Amino acid sequence: LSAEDKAAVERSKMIEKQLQKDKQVYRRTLRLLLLGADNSGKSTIVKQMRITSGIFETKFQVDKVNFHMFDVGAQRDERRKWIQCFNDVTAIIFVVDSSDYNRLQEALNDFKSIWNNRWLRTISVILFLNKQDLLAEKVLAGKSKIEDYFPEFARYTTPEDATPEPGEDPRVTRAKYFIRKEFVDISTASGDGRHICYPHFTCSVDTENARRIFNDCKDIILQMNLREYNLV
Amino acid sequence: CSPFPLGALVPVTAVCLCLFVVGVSGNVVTVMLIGRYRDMRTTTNLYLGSMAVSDLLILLGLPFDLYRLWRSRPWVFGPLLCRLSLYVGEGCTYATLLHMTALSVERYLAICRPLRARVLVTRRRVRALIAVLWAVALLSAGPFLFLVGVEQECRPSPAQLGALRVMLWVTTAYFFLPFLCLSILYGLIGRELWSGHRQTVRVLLVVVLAFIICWLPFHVGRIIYINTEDSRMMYFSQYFNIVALQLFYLSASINPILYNLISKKYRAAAFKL
Amino acid sequence: TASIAQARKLVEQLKMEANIDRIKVSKAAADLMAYCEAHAKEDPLLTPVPASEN
Amino acid sequence: VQLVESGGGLVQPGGSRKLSCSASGFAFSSFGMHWVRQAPEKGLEWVAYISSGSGTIYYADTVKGRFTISRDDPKNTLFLQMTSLRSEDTAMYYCVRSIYYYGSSPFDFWGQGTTLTVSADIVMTQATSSVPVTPGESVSISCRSSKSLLHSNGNTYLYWFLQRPGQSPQLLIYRSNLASGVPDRFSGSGSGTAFTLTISRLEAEDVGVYYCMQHLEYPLTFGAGTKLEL
Amino acid sequence: ELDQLRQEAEQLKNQIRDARKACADATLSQITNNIDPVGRIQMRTRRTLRGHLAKIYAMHWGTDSRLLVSASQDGKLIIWDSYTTNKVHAIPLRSSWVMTCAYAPSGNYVACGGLDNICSIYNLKTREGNVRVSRELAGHTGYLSCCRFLDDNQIVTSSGDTTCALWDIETGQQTTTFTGHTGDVMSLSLAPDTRLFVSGACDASAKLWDVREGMCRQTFTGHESDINAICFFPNGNAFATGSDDATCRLFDLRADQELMTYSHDNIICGITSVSFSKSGRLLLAGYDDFNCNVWDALKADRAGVLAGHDNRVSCLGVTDDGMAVATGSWDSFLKIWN
Ligand SMILES: CC[C@H]1OC(=O)[C@H](C)[C@@H](O[C@H]2C[C@@](C)(OC)[C@@H](O)[C@H](C)O2)[C@H](C)[C@@H](O[C@@H]2O[C@H](C)C[C@H](N(C)C)[C@H]2O)[C@](C)(O)C[C@@H](C)C(=O)[C@H](C)[C@@H](O)[C@]1(C)O
């Protein structure tokens, strides 16, 4: 064999070793996809969770494990095309503010389209309800009510398994639990046990959101290992 | 006196036949979904398939013993064939035990661990692990090729009892270490996800219970057989090793059912089959 | 306004697209078949070349 | 790119010397290095060769065992340890870079080198040692090889270098194929045993010595060199 | 005034439809029914290219049938050699989400892009030896879909903002803009004469544009789903279009109408990549059934099937001489056939 061919094979082996080394850092990182509407408070989330451009990458390390969150803001309403590129990802954090009672139907339709996607059938969706203080103040003052948009708000009682935080009015608890039930009703549709949603409550000044995301990803990884390592 | 009269030899042979047929059915069903399916090549599925082929060699060596269980005094279909059969026999048992130990360790490393160090799946790792486990099984079965010889069912000569005792006492680790690992690792596994998951805890519990009830009487056997100093001890050895063999074959038939049929992916592959 | 602008643009585009020469399907199919046959022997996928040229 | 070599001086035979070579402006880790010695009024000779990551290191038949070479990737340096020097080791050493891939140009840049004054192989022969030629007409240089340089893959391994008086050699042809920065006036054609280098119009800047090198095996061998009189 | 313009537009559409129908005197099948059968062709995996750390999405052959470029969601561009099966170069990308890649005809530049809304052009003939960022074309308000090299100075690109742009490598500015489509443009296909190019978009219609004029001359319709792949005939007068409806179509630049339709009651999965051979006798099409079907371009009968990949066939390419075919799926495996 000629010398140039042997040198080329040696360079290819070096490149393969470099790829094998990059495998260690590529497999030990979790890629999350942040989604949300225009009025959603995802900007506050990305600016406070720092523990013409296209894709927005945010790398944050918590509990000795790193997460790479990807956000799409420069794209139009077209989503069914490029979302197939966001497959195999670790988790999909869909943030939506519930204080806007007018555009709740749009967010519900968006969540339904995300959950009922043909390619996103395996990846779960982590649901976050941002801007809780504004909604609580608005429902306590009585300015804008819920039954003016959804007639099912009056025909809903407080569930018995509710565990509210001591120090809040029962009205805001009933409202948040009704919103959670309405989100679960569309989340459980076409579930088939392959993926489960994680409805969680959050705020803007809330700082332990990273811990909740870590716990949700831990549960997701546990379910993945149970489905993979023959234990489910 | 006569060993194993017909009144007890017929029911044990019938239960042996039904155990054999259900075991071979389960084992061919297990092995037929790992060859033509590419999604069924999970790291744990390689250990599952290796245990399956080990149990398959066990079950194909089984007939040459059922038939021994009938007429022990005649020839054994070859001087070297009996030694080869005992060798592969013990090998497959050692390989299955080592595979169960490795599978418990892998389930611990995959289900229990912090999201710090949780991945290697080198493929290289799983292949080298199965290779090393099979090599250790064959190395441990080698002394059975060394000991057994032609001295008038081809029984060993009563002049090497010390070597047999010490070797089986080295093979006692193949029962204590699997019991010491598969119990505490599955223990932490059931502890984390309990303090759908209750189904996994029940599965692990019934698995370890079957493991104990199927592997303990076997070793009682070895050890008793090695304590055959009296004439009545010979008869007790017969009547204990018969049920020990039956329980070991029950283990070999139920192990794929316990480790494969419970999985959703395996049932999906069986449905698409 | 922009609606009248896009309407006029679409009208102009349709008027320009309408003034194009279109040949029959028979002659086009004949030309395509002739071009495909003219290179039938020079196709490694259609004609399996021996291993000496691979 | 830039290569700065140092370590020359008056060394008695039998001593030890560490020649250093610092590279600046390119990826030294991805480029393999070669050492070439040149005696005063003589031809070229390959000394040693090192690859990327020190995975492939080779020496010539006359320096095997005595001299060694090492590289430092974090510091971007090359070191050459020469021990037990002989009386014939007086020469000028050049450190050259070369990358190996499809469409590459090995031995493209030649360093400055340092002088040192102490106290089978495919031998390349050239029937034309000195051709006094007038500028403006075409020049034809011949080269004969003892072994067929045409490998089974169909590629021809032959390199042409132009060493101008007082300047470092420059690569003209690396494979018929023309090197980068070299004008199209140079061409090369021939079979696996004979080669001809053709210059359409020679200018005042084309004066120099033409060396040929074969790259079929690891122990490279240079030619005698053809010089042209202006 | 808007109603009159809309009525005139619909009247012109009806007129052009009647004109295209009047020219359809006979179909291609009634003429090609007399040709000899193509039979069956068997393709076996000759070379297997492994090393990709993510899912493969695009590939392209250079001016020679030896080098190959491919893209993966990791953000690494690996130059593959089909003969000796080694890795030539390794270009690290800043954005990992890449969806398209191309090789310049001069063999000196390689373009890439994706969800980053910016096109990165790297130089392979640098004097320093290491690949560095050469050109960064930005300005598109959407993700890049496909890019192809026309010359060593200009390059066309397509984005999800319903606009196509012909950038200049020298200055880095939009030289020609195409805003005739009404949906997200998906795929592009240049002409062998390097003067026209046909683009398939999300509006279930393909449009042909010029490099100098910059105006769409013909509009083809007939698809009932999202067109995702497109490739022109080697002669430069016809082109195939594939959609998610599992029905491929073959349109003609001269006839200005649909000529042939490829479909099967067994296939229901969408088409991802379509390409032609050196002579155009056979039509290759990658489907989402983990297989790739090669039909006859004139008889539309199933000539061959390829089940080498276990994942969705994402990208498919044919060499300039038709000596080998490259197939890349999401299983990080880039296989070579024949
Ligand atoms: C002397 C006289 C005894 O011989 C033996 O013990 C030999 C030396 C066994 O190997 C000894 C070898 C020994 C001692 O090794 C420690 C021990 O494992 C037992 C006792 O079998 C053989 C082959 C047994 O195979 C073993 O049957 C076991 C129930 C399971 C074991 N394998 C499936 C798990 C398998 O190999 C086997 C065929 O059942 C014996 C049948 C004919 C009997 O039941 C009769 C009554 C035997 O007790 C015997 C002939 O009187």
mmCIF file of C-alpha atoms in Angstrom, chain C residues 3-4 7-8 11 13-18 20-29 31-33 35-36 39 42-46 53-54, chain E residues 2 5 12-13 16 19-20 23-26 31 35 38 43 216-219 234-235 252 254 256-257 259 277 279 281-282 298 321-323:
data_model
loop_
_atom_site.group_PDB
_atom_site.id
_atom_site.type_symbol
_atom_site.label_atom_id
_atom_site.label_comp_id
_atom_site.label_asym_id
_atom_site.label_seq_id
_atom_site.Cartn_x
_atom_site.Cartn_y
_atom_site.Cartn_z
ATOM 1 C CA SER C 3 -54.716 43.942 -1.170
ATOM 2 C CA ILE C 4 -55.152 45.856 -4.433
ATOM 3 C CA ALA C 7 -54.279 41.507 -6.703
ATOM 4 C CA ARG C 8 -52.701 43.564 -9.495
ATOM 5 C CA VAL C 11 -53.285 39.573 -12.434
ATOM 6 C CA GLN C 13 -48.416 37.288 -13.355
ATOM 7 C CA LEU C 14 -51.386 35.377 -14.789
ATOM 8 C CA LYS C 15 -51.436 37.576 -17.903
ATOM 9 C CA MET C 16 -47.720 36.943 -18.428
ATOM 10 C CA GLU C 17 -48.036 33.192 -17.814
ATOM 11 C CA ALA C 18 -50.932 32.966 -20.281
ATOM 12 C CA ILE C 20 -46.387 31.158 -23.444
ATOM 13 C CA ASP C 21 -46.039 28.617 -26.252
ATOM 14 C CA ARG C 22 -47.159 25.109 -25.250
ATOM 15 C CA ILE C 23 -46.350 22.116 -27.448
ATOM 16 C CA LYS C 24 -48.403 18.933 -27.646
ATOM 17 C CA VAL C 25 -47.767 15.947 -25.392
ATOM 18 C CA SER C 26 -46.954 13.542 -28.244
ATOM 19 C CA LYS C 27 -43.871 15.407 -29.477
ATOM 20 C CA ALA C 28 -42.631 16.002 -25.925
ATOM 21 C CA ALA C 29 -43.008 12.316 -25.043
ATOM 22 C CA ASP C 31 -38.346 13.681 -27.517
ATOM 23 C CA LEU C 32 -38.102 12.354 -23.955
ATOM 24 C CA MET C 33 -38.079 8.747 -25.181
ATOM 25 C CA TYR C 35 -33.210 11.281 -25.219
ATOM 26 C CA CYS C 36 -33.641 8.367 -22.807
ATOM 27 C CA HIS C 39 -28.139 7.187 -23.277
ATOM 28 C CA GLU C 42 -24.315 4.713 -20.852
ATOM 29 C CA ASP C 43 -26.238 4.033 -17.614
ATOM 30 C CA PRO C 44 -24.546 1.866 -14.947
ATOM 31 C CA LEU C 45 -27.851 1.394 -13.105
ATOM 32 C CA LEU C 46 -29.755 0.144 -16.160
ATOM 33 C CA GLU C 53 -15.030 -0.980 -13.997
ATOM 34 C CA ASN C 54 -16.540 -0.485 -10.520
ATOM 35 C CA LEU E 2 -60.938 44.082 -5.918
ATOM 36 C CA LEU E 5 -59.494 41.877 -10.348
ATOM 37 C CA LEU E 12 -57.382 33.773 -16.666
ATOM 38 C CA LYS E 13 -56.869 30.658 -14.536
ATOM 39 C CA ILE E 16 -54.970 28.613 -18.948
ATOM 40 C CA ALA E 19 -55.443 25.693 -22.826
ATOM 41 C CA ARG E 20 -53.451 23.046 -20.944
ATOM 42 C CA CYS E 23 -52.964 20.375 -25.633
ATOM 43 C CA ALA E 24 -53.410 17.012 -23.847
ATOM 44 C CA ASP E 25 -54.280 14.986 -26.931
ATOM 45 C CA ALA E 26 -52.682 11.785 -25.602
ATOM 46 C CA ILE E 31 -47.165 6.136 -26.286
ATOM 47 C CA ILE E 35 -41.434 -0.022 -25.050
ATOM 48 C CA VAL E 38 -37.370 -2.734 -17.601
ATOM 49 C CA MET E 43 -28.840 -3.144 -5.557
ATOM 50 C CA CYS E 216 -41.859 32.476 -12.742
ATOM 51 C CA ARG E 217 -42.792 31.424 -16.278
ATOM 52 C CA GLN E 218 -44.823 28.259 -15.602
ATOM 53 C CA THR E 219 -46.948 27.052 -12.686
ATOM 54 C CA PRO E 234 -30.907 15.336 -16.900
ATOM 55 C CA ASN E 235 -31.946 16.877 -20.232
ATOM 56 C CA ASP E 252 -42.742 18.878 -18.298
ATOM 57 C CA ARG E 254 -42.336 22.181 -22.632
ATOM 58 C CA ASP E 256 -46.665 22.730 -19.221
ATOM 59 C CA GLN E 257 -48.758 19.931 -17.698
ATOM 60 C CA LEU E 259 -47.271 13.661 -17.789
ATOM 61 C CA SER E 277 -30.296 8.431 -12.910
ATOM 62 C CA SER E 279 -30.094 8.636 -18.442
ATOM 63 C CA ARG E 281 -34.833 5.621 -17.433
ATOM 64 C CA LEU E 282 -35.484 4.915 -13.738
ATOM 65 C CA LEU E 298 -41.946 5.673 -18.345
ATOM 66 C CA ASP E 321 -22.093 9.342 -13.820
ATOM 67 C CA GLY E 322 -24.674 7.109 -12.132
ATOM 68 C CA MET E 323 -22.008 4.738 -10.813
#
